[PDB]
Symmetry: D2
Subunit: 314 residues, 4 copies
Amino acid sequence: SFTIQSAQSIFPGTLVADIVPTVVESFSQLNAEDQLALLWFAYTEMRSITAANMILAQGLLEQIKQMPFEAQTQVMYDLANRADTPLCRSYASFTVNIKLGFWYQLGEWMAQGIVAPIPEGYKLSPKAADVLQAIRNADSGQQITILRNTVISMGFDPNAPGSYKKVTEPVSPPTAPAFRTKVTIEGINNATVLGYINNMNANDFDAAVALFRSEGALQPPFERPIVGQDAIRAYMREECQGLKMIPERGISEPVEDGYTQVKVTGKVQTPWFGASVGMNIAWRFLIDPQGKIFFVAIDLLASPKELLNLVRKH
Amino acid sequence: SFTIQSAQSIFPGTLVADIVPTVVESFSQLNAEDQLALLWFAYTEMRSITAANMILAQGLLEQIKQMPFEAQTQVMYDLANRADTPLCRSYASFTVNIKLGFWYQLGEWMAQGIVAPIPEGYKLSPKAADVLQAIRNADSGQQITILRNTVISMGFDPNAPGSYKKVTEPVSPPTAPAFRTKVTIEGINNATVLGYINNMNANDFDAAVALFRSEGALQPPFERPIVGQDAIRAYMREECQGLKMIPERGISEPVEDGYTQVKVTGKVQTPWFGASVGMNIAWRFLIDPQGKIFFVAIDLLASPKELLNLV
Amino acid sequence: SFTIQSAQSIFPGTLVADIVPTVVESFSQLNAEDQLALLWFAYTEMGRSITGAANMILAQGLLEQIKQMPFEAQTQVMYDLANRADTPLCRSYASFTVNIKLGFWYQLGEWMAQGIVAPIPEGYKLSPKAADVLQAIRNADSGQQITILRNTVISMGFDPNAPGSYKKVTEPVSPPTAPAFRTKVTIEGINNATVLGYINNMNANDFDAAVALFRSEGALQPPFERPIVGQDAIRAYMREECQGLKMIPERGISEPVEDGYTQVKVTGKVQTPWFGASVGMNIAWRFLIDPQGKIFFVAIDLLASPKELLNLVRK
Amino acid sequence: SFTIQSAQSIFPGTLVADIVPTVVESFSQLNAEDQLALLWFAYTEMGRSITAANMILAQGLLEQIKQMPFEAQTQVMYDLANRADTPLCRSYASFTVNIKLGFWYQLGEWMAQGIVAPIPEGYKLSPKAADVLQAIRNADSGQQITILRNTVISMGFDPNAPGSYKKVTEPVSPPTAPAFRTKVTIEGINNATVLGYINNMNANDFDAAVALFRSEGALQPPFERPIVGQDAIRAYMREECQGLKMIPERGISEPVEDGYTQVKVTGKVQTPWFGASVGMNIAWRFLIDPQGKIFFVAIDLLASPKELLNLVRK
């Protein structure tokens, strides 16, 4: 029958932004000093809008704020080196949005002279300058995804032995039915796909994850499939809060055993940038005969041209 | 010699969005039912990005959150009617950004079914439906400004007798000299004008304010001139934090007594919408012989065409 | 067989501080200015309160609202609280837990002392009725004075269950003392495992373990209150009103009674984190325990006098 | 004429609780395991504490300890006891006295709740540690409190070492308004400078109390160095005297050299940590210049209540 492995190969013509995992890989191989300078240059070169509000994150930022410049620079080398320190382990314990807010606060303090700057006239190594040109050449959604993915990977491995208790964020209540937008997708009336996108746009992660088969999977961009409603809901709650999915176009094809493959293309806006960064996205669904989601992949596309790439099975 | 009044008339061909103060006046005329309905349609029709995290505003938001729907509505009517109640007096005490964050939280709660909705089947009064239509046609910058000035004037007069102690926000440290961007303006090299714009983009209001005469004046769009370095400093700290001024063009003209008048056009972005709303702005400066600002007007322009009307 | 009403009459001679409800009743029939003047005399003639609840966001914001008001508007809010007027502030106050209401008034008293909140007017004279109340309070013992002040400020603002009430605020549930670090009480005259289990659980804030000692339809009757029936309601009361209580029982009698039930009376003192070892309240616990050792009924009484700690009359 | 040096010897009979610095010193010679065991055994006979480290830096570092596995929590406490150079120890050093005490209070409450690692089961005090515990068990209440306070305040790093972190500041409490102040009454004494000092301190009016000192006047707290000059005295009062209640009972006034007066007062001090539970037995020894300004005041924790009656004139 159908497996997660076979579902991953649906719509083979979908062109993803492989510049993202390429640059994240190159980035990760630089020394601490290059990584930090790249983060500063990448950040500065780029319209962000903001949480590290929570008491643990706020207090560790206050610890950094009271340190002399030399001790602040050491904390940042430790995060970029993935060193074993309590600050690195606490950073590992942070949810994605707290990691992002943590870095955003350090960037603001650097610009205010509160946190040690990159050393004036600092010289990017050859490999680092290459990485920065790679980032400059990428589109807006690719640039944000490289920055996000790079800072997320800093500090210690969060599942290594002796890991600290993972921080919990409040579940934001969903938009009430009466106030939800309903998407229209040119060429698609599939109730499961419309249900998924409408529930996600409402932050209704309970209703979105209920559409999944108990052993179904969600594959985020450039990640492994996340299997089962418990782990999918956890991913949605941590990584999909306030995403706005603006689907444009789709194709639906019956496949073997009464399953249906549906491809949708459109834009996703993140609360981090609002209407200033539309990420070019594809959703690839495999839907079972009962209308349960067996698989969905979210792909960051190479360019806006890929929004028009809806090729039927040959 | 110049006065604030005579300074106000510099660059007379400048076309300001009088739709904004118009629609704002219609809005103020409406009953509370129609005012709340319009706010809600505006907040739904329009990509906002954010505050009222401060203890007073947070606790008052929690008070509204625990009320039944009927008492929540009554509070919101009291704000629209500018009634004399502790909640209205506290709201009047808030800074501009706390008032905006307060209303933003109520709109998020209404969308989540935590705060009473506008009744399905509530129908706008005729006038209200006109006011709403007038807003839909106006451009983004003008819509944001209507929405801003409407909610800022809710609750009580902040300077009335019996007013509550005004709340204060933390003064944000300016951008450090090394990390500041310097603007270029086609057709302009005035050091005072460039110094004002660069200091404001760094949130360095002490440096911007030092560019004015003792009794120098700043006139925000559709407002009374603010007179004196202390009142200007107070206004910049409350209303200009995180504004990004993106001038494109300007003209300079010598006038009487060795004064200079300079008009600059371009865009301003606000942190509330970031790069998603560039408001269309002119700055009109009257500069004294020693290079001190006597007067500067900030004007919200009729349309993107006024960006070219320097003449 | 036993009912809540029959259980209420166990150990008939237990003499209770009836001056508390008397004085609480009289306090509330005074006008607002007298009520405020009397509270101010208490906070001053009793400045050994060790603390605060009201740190929580709602209570902190409403305090900041009162802080920014002019003296005339602050006095008006306190009159509204004393008059139990229908206002958002009085409805919010009504929604507070006991400890938040007490911390709220505590902050207002400190702010009055600091010149931040409008004081009782210079040389205010208590009406004759108010001087009678102050006199009764003065004649009452420490444990009784603490209860009158507590029960008086709790009853201010609006009826918390009136139509149009605001959602009740919730306090974080404090984790219990772990078993290895608990004190066990020893009570002279008593080895009843249920009674000891109850007192040790409460002194550890283990309200889940205390409530599990009750029958489904078991009741807890706090001083001068209606019985609270069932494990949900009793747990909600313990969480709100028993946090950090120290029960120092001294002596008890146990008696077998009809149907294989045992009745147990215990006397002792209770300390509250508001006053610590300062104020020991003279308390009797009256327990009716079923044949399985589950609690059917327990009354907590504030006793009329310290004599009552020896009144353990059997029959 | 008078020096801080000669002032220190006024009222030579006055017997102080020398057991306090004895035990503090003994305690600090023990290894980290004995130190933590003793803190727990001492704090366990002291649940009549009635209370802070509310402030964002302290709360976040407490949340950091709370999320740590037991092994890591114990290592942080060994670092504090060993005065190791770690960011946590440097932050701890930066704290005010009351934040240091609130920090240790939170860890004690967490230990009692099973949230922080206990003293290992069966743990056995070294011979020297059992000698320290015995001395603590024998000390009166005021002396036990003082030993615990001074012990925990001296943990973490040297707050004035090279590489120190920015000192945290606490909010200054508004004083009691004059209409609501108490006036003390002292048997034997109507000295307006002594009464003015005590009444001002009881109102938290540190500015008025400091204005009673000579420019180069000194305040000598129990078992500490003399604090010299109005700015230093004001900083000390703001940090360590908030909410103290002085209850002087008896005193003697003697005219001495150079137009000076010396005044000895005995009575009690209550602390907001303990309230009316613990009244510590205190003497105040004032040297007052001819203009009525304090040249020197020592506050002594007395050896026994018998010292309350040691008021002899010569």
